[PDB]
Amino acid sequence: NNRYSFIGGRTGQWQVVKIRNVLGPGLQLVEKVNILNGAVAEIPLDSAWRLQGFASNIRYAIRTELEALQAVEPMLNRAEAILAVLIPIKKSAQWWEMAQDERRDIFERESHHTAVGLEYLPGVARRLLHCRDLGEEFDFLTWFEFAPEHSSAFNELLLRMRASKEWEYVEREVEVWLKRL
Amino acid sequence: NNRYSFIGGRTGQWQVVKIRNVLGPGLQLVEKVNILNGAVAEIPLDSAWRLQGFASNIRYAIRTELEALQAVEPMLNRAEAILAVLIPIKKSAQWWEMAQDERRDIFERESHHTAVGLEYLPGVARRLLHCRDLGEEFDFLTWFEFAPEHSSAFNELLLRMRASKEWEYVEREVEVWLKRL
Ligand code: HEM
Ligand code: HEM
């Protein structure tokens, strides 16, 4: 099953350390996040929000980029990776109306998204989930996990991505920092 | 709402003219197709199958290709467009594992998918729906509609596409020919 749900509330595998409402409407602070592999039609007991998305095919990365990523990218669920950050992202209408070449040019040629992110591997593991096509309020759910030794580096990455051309099209962003229970 | 369902059964806006089970498991012959904008968790009793997909962003077409398409592509629901064909398609695991550049090169550089398709406009109107990401048995639901005038041309187009490199990755395909009621 390629669908994942993230329920903010009183139960889950992850304790919420903090929520930073970076851009646009925020997410209610809660005690924990519960992650479920599957859709979840009915709101859990004592929960404040649910986010959902699916794992999908590659949309931008070219073969040589995939080869570079595969050589260094870590797996999820490393024993040392006790911190995580869930970052829902929405991009503007102006982005989604662009053609494929226009988007790829902004994403890599101008913003160097993959080349910058590679600078943070193997420390940071990640998962990308898509949800615009489900009708959700965000377009992406992005997930990152790492040992505490990489927290400073991860915060620098965030600032570097926010300085990029690609980020001129980001309309909503929240950071949910988590610690593994 | 970006989701569409196609219910094969005894009711609907479209009468089934024929079903050709081109490759892989077919779809049961039925009297009619009912098309609904929205999902349908409860399939009607006298219906045989339900297909669903969503409209999404562009995956391959470049700006100059979109411009060419926009100059000539017809609207849906033209008065004369009394014939349609619903063609669910599934592509292989080897296709999906390829990177974005590899897929674009097969789609256009080798197969000329858009250049060939443009030869059949304005006669043929179309919609593309995506459903691999919903866990459906097919990956795409493709829809075409046109006057009787263009049936012979549409049949030529089908044969041309099936001769392409891109088609070497198609592993399931069915044609549901319809007439507007
Ligand atoms: C940690 C190192 C990172 C690496 C190696 C990396 C790599 C990538 C790659 C290769 C893609 C494209 C996938 C495809 O072709 O479909 C992608 C997409 C994406 N990434 Fe990153 N990324 C990193 C960090 C980040 C961070 C920190 C953020 C958010 C603050 C983020 C947000 C996104 C988004 C929103 C997308 C989807 C873009 C779109 O489809 O428009 N990434 N990432
Ligand atoms: C009638 C003229 C046609 C035109 C102008 C045309 C045009 C296109 C365009 C431009 C795309 C890419 C959309 C994107 O970038 O996301 C596309 C995708 C697609 N089309 Fe066609 N098409 C035509 C006929 C057909 C026919 C007859 C079939 C099926 C037999 C078909 C099957 C598909 C499929 C399966 C995709 C999805 C490809 C993928 O994402 O891997 N098309 N079409």
Residue numbers in the entry:
A (entry chain B), B (entry chain A): 2 to 182
Per the authors:
Chlorite dismutases (Clds) are heme b-containing oxidoreductases that can decompose chlorite to chloride and molecular oxygen. The two clades exhibit differences in (i) oligomerization, with clade 1 proteins being homopenta- or homohexamers6−10 and clade 2 representatives forming homodimers,11−14 and (ii) subunit structure, with “long” clade 1 Clds being composed of an N-terminal and a C-terminal heme b-carrying ferredoxin-like domain and “short” clade 2 proteins lacking the α-helices of the N-terminal domain. The only charged amino acid in the hydrophobic distal heme cavity is a fully conserved arginine (R173 in NdCld and R127 in CCld), which is proposed to be flexible and to switch between two conformations during catalysis, i.e., pointing toward either the heme iron (“in”) or the substrate entry channel (“out”).4,6,8,11,14,16 Importantly, the hydrogen-bonding network of this catalytic arginine is different in clade 1 and clade 2 Clds. In clade 2 Clds, R127 is H-bonded to Q74 located on a flexible α-helical loop, which in general connects the N-terminal and C-terminal ferredoxin-like domains in porphyrin-binding α + β barrel proteins.
As typical for a clade 2 Cld, its distal arginine 127 is hydrogen-bonded to glutamine 74. The latter has been exchanged with either glutamate (Q74E) to arrest R127 in a salt bridge or valine (Q74V) that mirrors the setting in clade 1 Clds. The Q74V variant mirrors the situation in the clade 1 representative NdCld and should exhibit an increased flexibility of R127 compared to that of wild-type CCld, whereas Q74E might arrest the catalytic amino acid by forming a salt bridge. We provide the crystal structures of Q74V and Q74E and demonstrate the impact of the mutations and pH on heme coordination and active site architecture by ultraviolet–visible (UV–vis), electron paramagnetic resonance (EPR), and electronic circular dichroism (ECD) spectroscopy. Besides heme coordination, the mutations are shown to have a strong impact on the thermal stability of the heme cavity but an only weak effect on the chlorite degradation activity. The conformational dynamics of R127 is shown to have a significant role in heme coordination during the alkaline transition and in the thermal stability of the heme cavity, whereas its impact on the catalytic efficiency of chlorite degradation is relatively small.
